[PDB]
């Protein structure tokens, strides 16, 4: 609730031209998020397929005993928060106030974010990009 609040772009396959963003959802748990969920080794969880799937054979549902509760949010919805957060990266990163804004393309958001503290003004980002 202190993440989202306002206001996405929304998620279109072209974010920034041309900044190849992996953080797009392919469609729901984007690609880099898929990398750091595949490479992390979790033997869990079971939600009406993993209990039975372990019954076909961690034991949060077999000693009982201990028991793991689900994390309040389905993965598609945490993905929805952070995907609207990726939507608000461009316009909210402007700012001029948090949060009552905006819809600006991601490229121009990094030329103003880059104009800001890497204080190279407009003649360098014009000539050239690629960056």
């Amino acid at each position: 609730a202190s993440v989202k609040s306002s206001q996405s772009s929304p998620i279109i396959p072209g974010f920034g031209g041309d900044f190849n963003l992996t953080l797009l959802e392919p469609v729901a748990r984007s690609a880099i998020e898929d990398l750091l969920f595949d490479k992390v080794t979790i033997a869990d969880p079971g939600y009406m397929q993993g209990y039975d799937d372990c019954m076909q054979q961690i034991c949060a549902q077999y000693v009982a005993g201990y028991k793991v509760l689900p994390p309040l949010m389905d993965v598609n919805m945490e993905a929805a928060y952070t995907s609207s957060l990726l939507g608000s990266i461009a316009g909210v990163g402007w700012t001029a106030g948090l949060s009552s804004f905006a819809a600006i393309p991601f490229a121009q958001s990094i030329f103003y974010r880059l104009n800001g503290v890497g204080i190279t003004q407009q003649v360098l980002s014009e000539n050239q990009k690629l960056i």
């Binding site: 989202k4 609040s5 306002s6 206001q7 996405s8 772009s9 929304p10 279109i12 389905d74 919805m77 929805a80 928060y81 609207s84 939507g87 608000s88 316009g91 009552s100 804004f101 905006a102 819809a103 600006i104 393309p105 121009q108």
Partner: protein, 45 residues
């Protein structure tokens, strides 16, 4: 009783325009004010 609602999220998504112009979602009403959090500072001694 009457389970299973899925009430998310939903932000008021401004749409991204294409050309030199770009849309923006400015508001109209102030509507201030909340009470907010306790910060605990101590124990009972």
């Amino acid at each position: 009783m009457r389970l299973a609602s899925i009430a998310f999220n939903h932000p008021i998504q401004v749409d991204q325009l294409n050309s030199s112009y770009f849309k923006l979602s400015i508001p109209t009403n102030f509507s201030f004010g909340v009470t907010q959090e306790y910060i605990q500072t101590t124990i009972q001694k």
